[PDB]
Amino acid sequence: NIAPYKFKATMYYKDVTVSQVWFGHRYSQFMGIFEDRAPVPFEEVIDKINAKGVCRSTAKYVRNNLETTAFHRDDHETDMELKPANAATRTSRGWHTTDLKYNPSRVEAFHRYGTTVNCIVEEVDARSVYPYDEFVLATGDFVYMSPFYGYREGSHTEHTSYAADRFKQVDGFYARDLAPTTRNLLTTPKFTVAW
Amino acid sequence: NIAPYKFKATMYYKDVTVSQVWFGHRYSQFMGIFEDRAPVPFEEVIDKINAKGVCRSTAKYVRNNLETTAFHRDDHETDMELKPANAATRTSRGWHTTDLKYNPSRVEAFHRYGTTVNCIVEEVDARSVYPYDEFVLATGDFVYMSPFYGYREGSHTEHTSYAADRFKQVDGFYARDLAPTTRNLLTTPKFTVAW
């Protein structure tokens, strides 16, 4: 058998984007743009996305050993409704909360920083090969954890590279489409995958 | 037939590069560098590059829903002559206007921003596969538009993902080497391709 083990998985991440804009006398310029994929915590994936189909308007995560907190449009936390993404040929289903990127208002001879947090959830096809100790996603991101890792019936003996607190298993999980199933959740440094 | 449809195409883009430099008491350091590929508009590709073989010293384009304008060395707009790129084994012809990257002058305990705009034009080999609704370039960039899309003889029915204003077709186009031909032009978010 040379065909890799194929299974369905769902990704959850927020496209944190903070851009620096320089406002000249008659023009505007981007002095710097910082794009980062912030993962979604288990509490939000369960109690907000799966339970109500909404994402928090803020991205709280760890990056370079710092608890960074990004706010969409620098506004207070608010529940944003998830909507389907733009149509694309030969692509799996995907949803997002924001479409237009935010930038600061125009103030003369001044630098300003405008943060944008766009919650994104996508259904990706995961692939794995022998010894099945890790799997990849349709986006090309590697996940160093066995697809069968878990706490039940000896699954704890499978390979895993992330800490214990970065993995969560939920029994009787009823998937909400934006029967019970055993849902696994892993919070990678750049995204959260559920399969 | 498994061989992808191969055709010649020309790319046009400007390597906008703005870097932040911190000048210490006895050293210099890069506090941040922002590199972006700004596309070249149809007016410049026709009236400046093809008509006269020169590129504007400024990059005006849309990025993250903002009309950003970058100036080379923060100087006024000027016509820059295109010259061949450095020799490289197994590489298609390419030309550029700037070679040395610009940085701000040294001023003590101060941050400074220096913008660099280097117009670049290259001849790349485009490839496409059935249903031929999209094609890739030698640089690995995807173009979500059928290679045969156009306004003539039913070509408008081909697949296209970009807006109407992002595509332009010119008849009787005489290619200028830095007989008439039907030249297609598409302004992608990061580059402009002509085939």
């Binding site: 694309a88 692509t91 995907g94 237009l100 990127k101 | 849309v62 829903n65 009309e67 807006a163 978010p189």
Partner: peptide, 18 residues
């Protein structure tokens, strides 16, 4: 798929200015 992210999860033509 990676290059379709901008066309799938963002507006490419809308411009905002003040």
């Amino acid at each position: 798929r990676n290059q379709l992210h901008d066309l799938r999860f963002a507006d490419i033509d809308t411009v905002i200015h003040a």
